[PDB]
């Protein structure tokens, strides 16, 4: 429209469009209408690339606008309402400066290049701030952080220097009920589980380089725990096998030449349910009711479906020793197996030890862990406790009963 | 085996010698071809009228 200050506005052309578009986005954003205008402008700046004086300069422009609008969104509700756009036009982000599309699967963005030099820093700021809440986090917040981490991880290639962490063992893994509802056999069980969890699974490195008092301490704490848990799992599979064996013996003695196959034991839905229709409709009505309870804006402050809540002792006891809900024990066994795998490789390989020593040193040249002092009295106790829990008991147990969890843990460890 | 014939056709169109590596490729290709041809084969040389004799002895 203006086209009147042709000589005057000749000085800086591209910058003028940039600033006026920025002001447009800002004044419209401050909805279902502002989002529409913003998206249309954000597409316009892509489509008007060829006409620009410096065609490459569109990159640092486009991203720029994007950041601004990411800032102006009111609440994570609006952010989740807006994200499907940015997930639609990813392939436009991947070309930093080239005006021709890239082959699907190749990205030309780098952590320290002109486009991302500030944007990655800023989005990491936002991710850190969202992580820092940790108490007042609605499920909307976790969904938003996930969308963001997945977007950024898909932008940069797998190989870039900032797309795989360099050996940072995550602290803050607690599953407690966020300092809410936080408080015989129950109390000692809770104390023992807390102690072993903290000292062994929170930091496998420390519990790998100890003074031979620490190792024996966690061992004398751990042993009875595993004893009780495995006794319970034995009761569980005993109930299953008793049911199946009685049914098979009856169905065999009730027919002419059946001769049932005692080997297979995979679960199957009972006959009087696999062919009914009233019961299926009722169960579907109930699942729909519960699901509608869950995904409602009134109840967005719940815990995940598998948290263990080390804090409330009695709830922990009710969770682990039940004989009908065995998933919690599977989580515990999986945790032990992972950590023991790492400790064994650390102790025995004497090659990853160098890498972890280097990583610990570079971030902090002052440390206290030996990293060299493995005389043999220690090494022995550690590599013995590992091969004891990880192999002598767990695999030997789930090699006869449930030969599918077996393959699962073996595949995951390898 | 899983009934996706076009990738392997396009590969063996280029490197036929691959068939020397193992025998099982020929057997599996024959399996898919035989399933392809069976219903045409039954329509002629009529064995459908004679299909009603594959039953087991009662105990």
């Amino acid at each position: 429209e203006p086209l009147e200050k042709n000589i005057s506005a000749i000085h800086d052309r591209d910058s003028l469009i940039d600033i006026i578009l920025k002001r447009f986005i800002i004044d419209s954003m401050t909805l279902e209408k502002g989002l529409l205008n913003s998206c249309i402008g954000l597409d316009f700046v892509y489509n008007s690339r060829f006409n620009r004086s410096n065609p490459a300069s569109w990159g640092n422009t486009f991203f720029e606008l994007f950041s601004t609008i990411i800032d102006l969104l009111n609440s994570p509700s609006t952010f989740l309402k807006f994200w499907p756009y940015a997930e639609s036009r990813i392939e436009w982000f991947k070309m930093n400066t080239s005006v021709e599309p890239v082959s699907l699967g190749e990205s030309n963005l780098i952590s320290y290049k002109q486009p991302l030099y500030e944007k990655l820093r800023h989005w990491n700021d936002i991710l850190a701030k969202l992580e820092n809440n940790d108490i007042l986090n609605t499920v909307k917040h976790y969904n938003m952080k996930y969308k963001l981490e997945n977007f950024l991880s898909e932008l940069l290639p797998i190989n870039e220097e900032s797309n795989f962490n360099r050996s940072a063992s995550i602290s803050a893994l607690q599953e407690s009920d966020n300092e809410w509802n936080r408080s015989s056999s129950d109390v000692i069980f809770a104390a023992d589980y807390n102690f072993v969890f903290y000292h062994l699974i929170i930091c496998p490195i420390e519990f790998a380089f100890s003074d031979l008092e620490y190792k024996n301490d966690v061992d004398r704490s751990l042993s009875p725990l595993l004893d009780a848990i495995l006794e319970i799992e034995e009761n569980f599979y005993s109930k299953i096998k008793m049911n199946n064996r009685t049914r098979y013996s009856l169905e065999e003695a009730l027919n002419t030449e059946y001769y049932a196959n005692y080997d297979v034991m995979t679960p199957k839905l009972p006959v009087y349910m696999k062919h009914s229709n009233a019961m299926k409709m009722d169960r579907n009505e109930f699942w729909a009711n519960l699901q509608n309870i869950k995904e409602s804006d009134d109840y967005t402050l719940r815990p995940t479906i598998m948290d263990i809540s080390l804090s409330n002792t009695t709830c922990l006891y009710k969770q682990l020793t039940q004989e009908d809900d065995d998933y919690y024990r599977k989580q515990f066994i999986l945790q032990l197996c992972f950590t023991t795998n790492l400790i064994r490789n650390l102790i025995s390989s004497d090659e990853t030890r160098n890498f972890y020593k280097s990583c610990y040193l570079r971030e902090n040249p002052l440390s206290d862990i030996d990293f060299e002092n493995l005389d043999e009295v220690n090494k022995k106790r550690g590599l013995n406790l590992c091969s004891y829990i990880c192999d002598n008991r767990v695999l030997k147990f789930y090699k006869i009963k449930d030969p599918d969890f077996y393959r699962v843990i073996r595949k995951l460890m390898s | 085996i899983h009934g996706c014939v076009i990738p392997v056709i396009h590969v063996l169109k280029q490197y036929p010698k691959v068939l020397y590596v193992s025998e099982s490729l020929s057997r599996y290709l024959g399996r898919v071809f035989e399933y392809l041809l069976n219903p045409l084969y039954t329509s002629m040389t009529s064995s459908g009228e004679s299909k009603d004799m594959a039953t087991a002895l009662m105990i």
């Binding site: 108490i135 009920d177 049911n243 679960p267 839905l269 009087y272 479906i305 809900d325 | -």
Partner: protein, 149 residues
Amino acid sequence: GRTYFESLCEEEQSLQESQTHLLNILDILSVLADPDDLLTESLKKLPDLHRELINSSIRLRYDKYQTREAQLLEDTKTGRDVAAGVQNPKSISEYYSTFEHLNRDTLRYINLLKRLSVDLAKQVEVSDPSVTVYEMDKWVPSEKLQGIL
């Protein structure tokens, strides 16, 4: 400069004074470099304006550091600290515990369907003489018994 928002407002006010001074300096510069007397008065007005621009700028950088410090001080406050004053913990604990019971009961119910289910004997008798081989999985219970179940 107590809050991140208030410090940003002070910075904006410091930006405006610098802008007016800069624009006036530029116009005097144009008059001086324009293709005497008017040029002589301008050549003095320019030092008069100089005793102003540096002082105003000074302030802008000072406030930039001020704002950076406040932002970092605010970002140190974690979520736990803010929720120290919630008036009623009780209801919060009751509500959270309830969710834990509901999760554990759901796993038992789902486990207790296909995985721990117990079923019928499967005695088999077939009326049609044609059936010479029986699948043994298509066996179902009689319609009268099915209604009761």
